[PDB]
Amino acid sequence: TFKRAETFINNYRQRERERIRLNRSAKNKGDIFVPDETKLLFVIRIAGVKNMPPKIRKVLRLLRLSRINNAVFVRNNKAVAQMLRIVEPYVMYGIPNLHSVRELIYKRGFGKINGQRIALSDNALIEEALGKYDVISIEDIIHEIYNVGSHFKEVTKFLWPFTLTPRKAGYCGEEINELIKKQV
């Protein structure tokens, strides 16, 4: 449709607002919050606003948030924090409680095997694809993801960016399970 001039200015203001927060938080504020209580999170994307800063665009892609509500098993450590804080305005990070991960895997589990949404319905699919990864079933997937097993990164690659379609632009902790409960 016909875009009105106010929308273009609103994009510029948000961009300048987005650019500023990025400049403060990253440069001269290298200190990071280091999320804890797990080795695995369930980050989701609230809304990637149009015309992102080019820094932002891969942060969704690399940690697998290329689409909205993409809940992914990410290795919880200091390393993800700065990248997530780069993308923190558009994401919610929270802990995948065992029930939430199991419930997600049991019903909404569509693991991105070969980059496609492959349902985790059959425990053999987890067993066959993750035989060397020690994940043998949906319950074992939770042990390898929610409990972040030895091959959690491989399990996460086996897993998918679960679209937990519904959110605050930051910490959730157990609130990711709340979204997962509604999503799954």
Binding site: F2, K3, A5, E6, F8, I9, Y12
Partner: protein, 137 residues
Amino acid sequence: KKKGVLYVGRLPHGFYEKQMRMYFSQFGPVLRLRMSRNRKTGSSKHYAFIEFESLDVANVVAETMHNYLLYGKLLQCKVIPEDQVHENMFKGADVPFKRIPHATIARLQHEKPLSKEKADKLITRHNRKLKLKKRKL
């Protein structure tokens, strides 16, 4: 047929060259876009000159987008006749404004030591600066 050049004044902050180009394109083609920007920091002087492909469409935008209440600013969109338009009125149009950081460049100059002879030339120059005031007082 003849290019229709639009003076858009009282531009709300943010409605810049890229943003004007997308918005004004819907009305008609914008051959090139020039916004006045500051001497040093290149900040908008809040008026831009938008020449459309034809006078006719530019007249439509001038009528439609005059006294437009935008972000608490009344937009002034006037078709400037070609007689007042000059050769460089649209100079450097659609050319990025590479703000030269003059202040830090001199800071790099400050960080850059003069050549030992040229540094001594400065010291003597300070000595000249010292003796220039000598008969001054």
